[PDB]
């Protein structure tokens, strides 16, 4: 507990007390009247006790109504962020008219990192924020405090981005995304502040809340695209390593809930993931043979892929009957994390030094190793004995068959076949 909370409640404490002592005095008056129904001063003090009761009733009501738990702070954030908007707009001016200047001491990449960190936090907590807008205000105000005190530094990040970035239309776009963020933020501020976690607020509040929630979502992942694609443009980026670690730890925590989807559906998901990652990584190998620059997009898409893999693996991990297989798959995917870590590491190292053959030797051996991890996950999902992995493989096979037959039918149209 916090002391000043106890202090601010001491009013409510007092009014509840007064409830009790008023009840006391009034009930000794009740005793004295049970002695004799008509006692003038006793009746007078009974009325006075009752009046004290009613007064402190209304005082409790007053304290609860004016309590407004945590409302203050959302508007504090509101104003803070409006100031953020204003300075963002000065940035837009000094860019569109081309007057803004970087703080050249710092470097861009770390700035992007800070972006990532803050938005990750926000993204993470908005859904709990939404649930608080459903039920509880205490944690609600707490969380909104955190997100605001994250916004302002993220604003600092935005201003760095503006003043430093080179591609003028593109940096302007970055700040557009910043603006979207802030708009979403104010919108959620509203939604919640009127919402107050009250089930009694009408479904208009509900609606406002959820579509705002989405709005923040799309903002967040568009940001994600922007930052990681800058990272791809960036020659060397260990940031994706952090993403991998996030995958790993969330993988570790596991989903406390019960399975929803069909395990066979999960199996389809993993097989798509694995075939994707395999073809991508070998194509990456080929490009390494050709040229480095393209690994960036390649690396980040890989990262995303691993993230989805783990993401759906957790409900997959809980969606079978034989948990041993789940932890086995867990082993598999961790090792995937390690391998892809090595992969992106060496990919960036090459992106520094496209000349070196020792780099590419590292590349190819890493590629091998991770290929075997892919094989591992292949055998894991096959060991997922559910359904028939042959079903999806044969679906792929027949798809290839129709590809063949379409080629044949065009042959006939051309009459090349004879």
């Amino acid at each position: 507990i916090s002391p000043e909370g106890r202090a601010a409640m001491e009013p409510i404490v007092i009014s509840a007390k007064t409830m009790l002592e008023s009840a006391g005095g009034l009930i000794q008056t009740a005793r004295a009247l049970a002695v004799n129904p008509r006692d003038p001063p006793r009746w007078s003090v009974l009325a006075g006790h009752s009046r004290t009761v009613s007064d402190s009733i209304k005082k409790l009501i007053t304290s609860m109504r004016d309590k407004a738990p945590g409302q203050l702070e959302c508007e504090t954030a509101i104003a803070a962020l409006n100031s953020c908007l204003r300075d963002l707009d000065q940035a837009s001016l000094a860019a569109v008219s081309q007057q803004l200047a970087p703080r050249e001491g710092i470097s861009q990449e770390a700035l992007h990192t800070q972006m990532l960190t803050a938005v990750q936090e926000i993204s993470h907590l908005i859904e709990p924020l939404a649930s608080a807008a459903r039920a509880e205000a205490s944690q609600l105000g707490h969380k909104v405090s955190q997100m605001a005190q994250y916004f302002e530094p993220l604003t600092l990040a935005a201003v760095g981005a503006a003043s430093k970035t080179l591609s003028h239309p593109q940096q302007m776009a970055l700040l557009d995304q910043t603006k979207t963020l802030a708009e979403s933020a104010l919108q959620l501020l509203y939604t919640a502040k009127e919402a107050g976690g009250n089930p009694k607020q009408a479904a208009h509040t509900q609606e406002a809340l959820e579509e705002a929630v989405q709005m923040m979502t799309e903002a967040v992942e568009d940001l994600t695209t922007t930052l990681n694609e800058a990272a791809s443009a960036a020659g060397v980026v260990g940031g994706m390593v952090d993403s991998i670690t996030q995958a790993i730890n969330q993988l570790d925590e596991g989903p406390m809930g019960d399975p929803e989807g069909s395990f066979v559906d999960y199996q389809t998901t993993m097989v798509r993931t694995a075939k994707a990652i395999a073809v991508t990584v070998q194509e990456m190998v080929t490009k390494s043979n050709t040229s480095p620059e393209e690994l960036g997009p390649l690396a980040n898409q890989l990262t995303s892929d691993y993230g989805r893999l783990a993401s759906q693996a957790k409900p997959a991990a809980v969606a079978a009957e034989n948990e041993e297989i789940g932890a086995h798959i867990k082993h598999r995917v961790q090792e995937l994390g390690h391998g892809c870590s090595a992969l992106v590491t060496k990919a960036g190292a090459l992106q520094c030094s496209p000349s070196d053959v020792y780099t590419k030797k590292e590349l190819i051996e890493c590629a091998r190793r991770v290929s075997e991890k892919v094989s591992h996950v292949l055998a894991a999902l096959q060991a997922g004995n559910r359904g028939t992995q042959a079903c999806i493989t044969a679906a792929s096979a027949v798809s290839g068959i129709i590809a063949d037959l379409d080629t044949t039918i065009m042959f006939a149209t051309a009459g090349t076949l004879n």
Partner: protein, 179 residues
């Protein structure tokens, strides 16, 4: 013969378990003059993981000291990190002694069982460490300390990864006689 039977029919669990038992049989049989060193290598990786676990921990604690040194709102800085660091601080020594017994008394299997337990227990605070870390990330006023804790947290996450890996290595290496 296990391979041949699998060739007869691929996914029959009988074949799969046959290969399983085959594999650990090869292990055990190797474990005549070996599994001295095979368990030893299991270990070697394990205490690797433990060492950088503690190293990352020292990183964390240093970050905590600069972190607490920083804020003007030093009292009530809303840190999950202070309890975080207290928990991992109380969590380190047992892991330390697990490592110490592992190196000093390697043959005694129970010591390595103990180190396994120390590892799996030591895991839990990792996610909360990084959580407080990322939460604190913006909070700082010295971005230098921000990098401090940032690279620290990367150490941490990597660690917990290899930590859990080492854990699975233990569990496959488990010998169910702990009672």
């Amino acid at each position: 013969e296990a391979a041949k039977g699998a060739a007869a029919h691929p996914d029959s669990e009988e074949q799969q378990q046959r290969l399983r038992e085959a594999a650990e049989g090869l292990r055990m049989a190797t474990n005549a003059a070996a599994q001295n060193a095979i368990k030893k290598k299991l270990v070697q990786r394990l205490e690797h993981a433990a060492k950088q676990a503690a190293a990352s921990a020292t990183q964390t604690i240093a970050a905590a000291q600069h972190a607490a040194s920083a804020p003007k709102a030093s009292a009530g800085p809303q840190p999950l990190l202070v309890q975080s660091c207290k928990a991992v601080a109380e969590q380190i020594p047992l892991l330390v002694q697990g490592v110490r017994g592992s190196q000093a008394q390697p043959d005694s299997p129970s010591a390595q069982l103990a180190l396994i337990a120390a590892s799996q227990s030591f895991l839990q605070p990792g996610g909360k460490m990084v959580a407080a870390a990322k939460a604190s990330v913006p909070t700082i006023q010295d971005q230098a300390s921000a990098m401090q804790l940032s690279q620290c947290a990367k150490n941490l996450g990597t660690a917990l990864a290899e930590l859990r890996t080492a854990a699975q290595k233990a569990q496959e290496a488990c010998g169910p006689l702990e009672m």
